[PDB]
A paper describes a structure:
Likewise, CBA120 with its four TSPs (TSP1-TSP4, encoded by ORFs 210–213, respectively) infects enterohemorrhagic E. coli O157:H73–5, E. coli O77, O78, and Salmonella enterica serovar Minnesota6. TSPs form homotrimers, which in the case of TSP1 and TSP3 are broadly divided into two domains.
Herein, we describe the crystal structure of full-length TSP2, which reveals a small head domain formed by a D1 fold module, lacks the D2 fold module, and its N-terminal 168 amino acids corresponding to the interaction region of TSP4 are structurally disordered. For both trimers, 168 N-terminal amino acids have no associated electron density; thus, these were not modeled. The TSP2 trimer assembles into a 160 Å elongated structure with a shape common to other TSP glycosidases, distinguished by having a head-like region, neck, and an elongated body. The structured region comprising amino acids 169–921 can be broadly divided into the two canonical tailspike domains; the N-terminal head domain (residues 169–244, or ~ 8% of the entire 921-residue TSP2 polypeptide chain) and the C-terminal body domain (residues 256–921, or ~ 72% of the entire TSP2 polypeptide chain), which are connected by a 12-residue α-helical “neck”. Replacements of the two aspartic acids by alanine residues abolished the halo formation, thus confirming that Asp506 and Asp571 comprise the catalytic machinery.
Residue numbers in the entry:
A (entry chain B), B (entry chain A): 266 to 663
């Protein structure tokens, strides 16, 4: 067998379709091996360092691999190695990537409609940003549509509970599109239609944002996204026309969620807890959720609980519709100070509201919200329906 | 080729990285074979009977297998064979498991963040509990977090329509956590943060419970869970802080769903039909859904229909919010006797209620609910809005 791709490049096939065995990609590693088939005439093909290897006399060895690629095929070593380049080659390869293990990277870009990534769990199959890297661990570029990101973790320096972060990092960024193509869904140039699903992905341990979807991107679907341990903002969205189902964000130093300039969004099933988490040392108050400058939002079946300051702050927003909403036991950083929903120059229709303050119910004495609603201005038009005061006994008269 | 792993254990390599072909795991079967590679220095590697095989001389043979394991790698035979140990070895292996076929098991435990399981369908790829086994077919242990269970069946004795059950069986049990770790998500000891996803899993044919999530577990997500043919209770949950989407439970001898001591839960999209199923012979009335001793629940877009007794019984519960609810044509075991929603010492806000009783509409004469609402106590605080009486013609004056 050939002992490495370096030797494969020095091995000329003598017959078309010739089978060769590659022991491993890189000498002494036993990783990334496989069977390859030769094309004597290799014009048209480009060496990519893992599934198309070209020889000195211009043949192409083709890896026999019907479906997805994995970083080991392109030279990844796992462990403490920097696997950025092999991961980047996978997503650029022309096929979906499967993550089979944990791989350190610095920054990765998804560019094509083939740049899907699949794992097998929210922890063990993962990309992990190297400690000295800054910026976005994964960026979805405006040329990338119709992909799936499914069942893997995106972890940063602070991923483990109670640990410190690398400044200036983001887990997944969706960049603002710079143009509009006219050949969707076959486009290869900038286009606003992301039309992609992020499903069962776990983001943890970044500084600025877990997930940050910038303005101008349509139909970024999330489903069962799980974000935790973010030094600042768990999830930011600044765009229009999307649906998220079953989002969960937990333990953020500032907001769990920022909606800023959003429109025509749906959130269906969500849990935002432990925002403004005091050990993360953020200076100042931030709510569990900011809804700012937004409009035509439908937010159903969410909960905001155990946040250090206000629950939900709705500001300068029109036509916010919420149906089934649980906010309780926020204001945890100073007792009897903060409120579960704060309205400022906004209009909202809230139905199915509940909010049993479990600290008042148990009589624990733990810090909790002074009450459910605060109006910071008198020009809001708001309706609220539901169980505004729960009706438990009141062991501590509150 | 080596004829069996037993032979492989008696085959010393004489060159590091040496390739060997294994025809099959166990003699005669033609299953579980593949290519392996030698480590002459075996130490620090443990025989696991499918992917790491140690020789009498201390070398390790390592299966060439980048991604998921399957039970056939570890000696499973399929068909009528008890594959419990092969399947247990997979979920213990350090990688996710793929089920490629139906395997009989007695009882499996999921213990690690690597213990994911994937199939390719809600039926053909499955675990099937042996008629000789009792207890939990799958137990998720309190050390197991961040896994995915996706697209496979979990079947017991009664899975086929109209068949009998083995006493004392449960499909999937999530045990009560015995401790709290301080290094999530990298924990290896008990923790309440399950943070896992059960997606497109079909549970059928168990005695006591299809799915039973015990108290103290956070964020067990379910997505497109299908439970049917359960002798007693389709799904029981007794915990807090979770979301389920598109749950369907069909044909249970007692309740389709028990929420007992739940809080801060969301169910979005659900159908619970044919509870208190008379052929399963249970003694007594059980509702489609029991909500007992619960609080701060948001339950949107569900349907309870065709159940033998009451539709939904809400008892000793605070702050139950329901937005979009369909209950009709329950009480099928005795005409004109049972009610679609029964309130007992509970508070609730129900919006977007509908309940066209299709049997009264068609004039079939089939047994159905006496009416939509019954109050067993007068200390309830309840708001109900929607279409309380549908307004069809009334062929039989009802
Ligand atoms: Cl909804």
């Amino acid at each position: 067998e050939c002992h490495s791709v370096a030797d494969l490049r020095n091995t000329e096939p003598t017959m078309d379709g010739q089978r060769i065995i590659l022991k491993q990609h890189t000498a002494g590693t036993l990783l990334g091996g496989g069977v390859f088939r030769a094309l004597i005439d290799g014009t048209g093909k480009t060496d990519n360092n893992g599934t198309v290897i070209k020889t000195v006399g211009g043949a192409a060895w083709l890896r026999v691999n019907a479906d997805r690629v994995n970083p080991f095929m392109f030279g990844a070593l796992g462990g403490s190695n920097d696997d950025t380049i092999p991961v980047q080659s996978c997503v650029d390869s022309g096929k979906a990537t499967q993550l089979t293990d944990a791989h350190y990277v610095s920054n990765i870009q998804l560019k094509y409609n083939t740049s899907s990534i699949y794992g097998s769990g929210l922890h063990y199959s993962r990309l992990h940003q190297l400690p000295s890297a800054t910026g976005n661990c994964i960026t979805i570029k405006d040329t990338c549509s119709l992909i799936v990101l499914d069942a893997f973790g995106v972890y940063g320096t602070g991923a483990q509970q109670g640990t410190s972060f690398t400044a200036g990092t983001t887990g997944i960024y969706v960049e603002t599109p710079s143009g509009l193509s006219a050949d969707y869904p076959f486009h290869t140039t900038a286009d606003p239609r992301r039309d992609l699903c992020i499903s069962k992905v776990h983001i943890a341990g970044f500084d600025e944002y877990g997930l940050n979807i910038d303005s101008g991107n349509f139909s970024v679907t999330t489903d069962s996204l799980l974000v935790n341990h973010i030094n600042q903002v768990g999830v930011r969205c600044a765009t229009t026309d999307w649906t998220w189902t079953n989002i969960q964000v937990n333990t953020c130093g500032k907001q769990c969620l920022v909606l800023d300039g959003c429109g025509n969004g749906r959130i269906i099933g969500g849990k935002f807890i432990w925002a403004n988490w005091q050990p993360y040392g953020t200076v100042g108050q931030f709510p569990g959720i900011t809804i700012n400058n937004s409009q035509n939002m439908v937010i159903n079946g969410i909960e905001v609980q155990d946040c250090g300051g206000n629950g939900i702050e709705i500001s300068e927003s029109y036509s916010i519709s919420m149906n089934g909403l649980n906010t309780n036991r926020n204001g945890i950083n100073a007792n009897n100070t903060f409120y579960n929903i704060v309205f400022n120059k906004s209009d909202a229709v809230i139905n199915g509201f509940v909010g049993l303050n479990y600290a008042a119910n148990s009589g624990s004495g733990a810090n909790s919200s002074a009450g459910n609603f605060q109006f910071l201005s008198n020009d809001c038009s708001v309706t609220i329906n539901g169980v505004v005061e729960t009706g438990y006994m009141g062991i501590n008269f509150i």
